[PDB]
Design a protein around this ligand. Structure first.
Ligand SMILES: *[C@@H]1O[C@H](CO)[C@@H](O[C@@H]2O[C@H](CO)[C@@H](O)[C@H](O)[C@H]2NC(C)=O)[C@H](O)[C@H]1NC(C)=O
Ligand SMILES: *[C@@H]1O[C@H](CO)[C@@H](O)[C@H](O)[C@H]1NC(C)=O
Ligand SMILES: *[C@@H]1O[C@H](CO)[C@@H](O)[C@H](O)[C@H]1NC(C)=O
Length: 149
């Protein structure tokens, strides 16, 4: 994925174990939470590179299958929409965990069976005040609440 070298202003404080998902306070690990100035925190993989004719490190927002973590995200996003996680949701393109980081996930934009998070979809609804648009496959449960209060 997108890679960026560590800058001296980065204050890396959180590492996550790839398979187990254990979070620990540390400055250094294979998967670390990186917050580039202004940007959302992201879990990034340390990768070996050649840069300016020398061996080095960089950090890349690479895909990570979080199934073995055995814990759910607080939000997910895919196909240009970000939604709260509701139990029953499928894995989307990225997952946000409550300690505070996005993970590049292994899913897509199918939120439930036959229900896609699609900006050009046919159903508008909300989850906890957050607006979303769904595309439904051809009864069908709508996994969200009406916009009317
Ligand atoms: C999640 O990570 C994957 C790689 O693990 C990213 O996919 C690659 O993105 C780069 C550009 O950044 C392309 O050159 C590659 O062809 C893509 N595929 C692979 C298999 O490497 C993906 O873009 C990342 N997703 C997000 C949302 O950042
Ligand atoms: C992620 O891992 C789980 C457990 O091994 C597996 O069932 C699932 O298919 C994996 N997802 C992808 C996209 O490989
Ligand atoms: C979001 O809404 C659902 C259903 O309306 C509810 O079950 C859930 O507790 C809400 N979550 C929060 C954080 O309010």
């Amino acid at each position: 994925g997108s890679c960026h070298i560590r800058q001296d202003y980065y204050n890396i404080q959180l590492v996550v174990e790839e398979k187990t998902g254990v979070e620990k306070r540390s400055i250094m690990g294979k998967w670390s939470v990186i917050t580039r100035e202004g940007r959302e925190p992201k879990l990034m993989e340390q990768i070996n590179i050649v840069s300016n004719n020398s061996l080095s490190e960089t950090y890349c927002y690479n895909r990570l299958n979080t199934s073995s973590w055995g814990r759910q995200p607080a939000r997910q996003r895919g196909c240009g929409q970000t939604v709260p996680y509701w139990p029953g949701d499928n894995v989307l393109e990225e997952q946000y965990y409550s300690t505070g980081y996005w993970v590049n996930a292994t899913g897509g934009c199918q939120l439930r069976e036959g229900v896609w998070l699609s900006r050009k979809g046919n159903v508008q609804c909300q989850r906890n005040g957050s607006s979303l648009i769904l595309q439904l496959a051809i009864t069908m449960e709508i996994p969200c609440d009406p916009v009317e209060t």
